[PDB]
Design an enzyme around this catalytic site. Structure first.
Site, mmCIF file in Angstrom:
data_model
loop_
_atom_site.group_PDB
_atom_site.id
_atom_site.type_symbol
_atom_site.label_atom_id
_atom_site.label_comp_id
_atom_site.label_asym_id
_atom_site.label_seq_id
_atom_site.Cartn_x
_atom_site.Cartn_y
_atom_site.Cartn_z
ATOM 1 N N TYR A 88 49.692 49.540 38.156
ATOM 2 C CA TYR A 88 50.991 48.863 38.222
ATOM 3 C C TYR A 88 52.227 49.758 38.225
ATOM 4 C CZ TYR A 88 48.532 44.417 37.456
ATOM 5 O OH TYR A 88 47.698 43.330 37.577
ATOM 6 N N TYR A 140 38.708 46.845 37.253
ATOM 7 C CA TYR A 140 39.712 47.699 37.871
ATOM 8 C C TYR A 140 39.470 47.794 39.372
ATOM 9 C CZ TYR A 140 43.161 51.521 38.000
ATOM 10 O OH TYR A 140 44.292 52.281 38.222
ATOM 11 N N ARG A 188 40.373 38.174 33.899
ATOM 12 C CA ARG A 188 40.620 38.679 32.552
ATOM 13 C C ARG A 188 41.138 37.582 31.627
ATOM 14 N NH1 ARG A 188 41.555 44.571 33.874
ATOM 15 N NH2 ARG A 188 43.335 44.918 32.481
ATOM 16 N N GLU A 248 43.123 40.163 37.258
ATOM 17 C CA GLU A 248 43.850 39.593 36.125
ATOM 18 C C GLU A 248 43.454 38.144 35.862
ATOM 19 O OE1 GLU A 248 45.525 43.144 35.212
ATOM 20 O OE2 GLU A 248 45.837 41.325 34.035
HETATM 21 C C1 MOG Z 1 42.823 44.647 36.535
HETATM 22 C C2 MOG Z 1 43.418 45.808 37.323
HETATM 23 N N1 MOG Z 1 44.669 46.247 37.064
HETATM 24 C C3 MOG Z 1 44.856 47.240 37.930
HETATM 25 C C4 MOG Z 1 45.887 48.136 38.235
HETATM 26 O O1 MOG Z 1 46.929 48.155 37.675
HETATM 27 N N2 MOG Z 1 45.660 49.024 39.230
HETATM 28 C C5 MOG Z 1 44.492 49.074 39.922
HETATM 29 N N3 MOG Z 1 44.249 49.951 40.912
HETATM 30 N N4 MOG Z 1 43.493 48.213 39.630
HETATM 31 C C6 MOG Z 1 43.667 47.305 38.647
HETATM 32 O O2 MOG Z 1 42.762 46.430 38.288
#
Ligand code: MOG
Length: 267
Positions: free
Chosen positions: A123, A80, A180, A177
């Protein structure tokens, strides 16, 4: 100095070459998970419940073609993106809970300026600011270079939140992503080689929207057999149902910790 610095991986939008990107993502992956704990061959990320702060984050240094440097803070527990450091200024997204905010109070501590957004980088919210959906936000080495630059210029003044949010969405997909899902990594590689810059097609989008779901199913799937068919989406939008881990082997690369491990089948 700070009680141990989290590992940093460098990447520059200069020598746009497929292998450089492959090495980049590969490094990130191995940097996140030790390699142990694999549910049905697929690797699992460390459980946050017992993960110390000193093992909570990873940094990624992004060098721009115009000699700019930005450092994103990736969460080991699920790749994240929590924030970034533009020189001596740091920006972090609005945390979802106490523990996270407390954990965030460790990243880029040596910054002269530290800030926290009122919104979240997730998102759903990030798209609102960008005023465009992911399917309208191009990805690739080109858009990436622009993104990195935008983050760097936030502190100066020429920011524009919509552009800023969009920049984040790009970095998130191309770095997080992509790690992932091996599939998404490939998509970026295809783009980079032919100097192609395009928006993520349905197949890519769905996978992102199904990461946690797949992680759950793959872990709770007895002998690999999925309890219930998970309808994914094909490149042209048409949905197709997945029935077993086997199909996801070359697709998914990392899974978020869901339930307690089985009888430690990894050996
Ligand atoms: C993998 C990943 N998805 C997201 C997201 O939607 N938001 C944020 N802030 N970090 C992420 O890291």
């Amino acid at each position: 100095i700070f009680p141990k610095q989290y590992p940093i991986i460098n990447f520059t939008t200069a020598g746009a070459t497929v292998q450089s990107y492959t090495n980049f993502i590969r490094a990130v992956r191995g940097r996140l998970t030790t390699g142990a704990d694999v549910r049905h061959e697929i690797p699992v990320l460390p459980n946050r419940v017992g993960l110390p702060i000193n093992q909570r984050f990873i940094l990624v240094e992004l060098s721009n073609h115009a000699e700019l440097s930005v450092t994103l803070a990736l969460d080991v527990t699920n790749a994240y993106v929590v924030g970034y450091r533009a020189g001596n200024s740091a920006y972090f997204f609005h945390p979802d809970n106490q523990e996270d905010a407390e954990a965030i109070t460790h990243l880029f501590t040596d910054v002269q300026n530290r800030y926290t957004f009122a919104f979240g980088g997730n998102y759903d919210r990030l798209e609102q600011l960008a005023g465009n959906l992911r399917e309208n936000i191009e990805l690739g080495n080109g858009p990436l270079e622009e993104a990195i630059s935008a983050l760097y210029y936030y502190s100066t003044g020429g920011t524009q939140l919509p552009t800023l949010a969009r920049s984040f969405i790009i970095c998130i997909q191309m770095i997080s992503e992509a790690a992932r899902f091996q599939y998404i990594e490939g998509e970026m590689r295809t783009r980079i080689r032919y100097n192609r810059r395009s928006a993520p097609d349905p197949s890519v989008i769905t996978l992102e929207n199904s990461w946690g779901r797949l992680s759950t199913a793959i872990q709770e799937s007895n002998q690999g057999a999925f309890a219930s068919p998970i309808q994914l989406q094909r490149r042209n939008g048409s949905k197709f149902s997945v029935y077993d881990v086997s199909i996801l082997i070359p697709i998914i690369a990392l899974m978020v910790y869901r339930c307690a491990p089985p009888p430690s089948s990894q050996f």
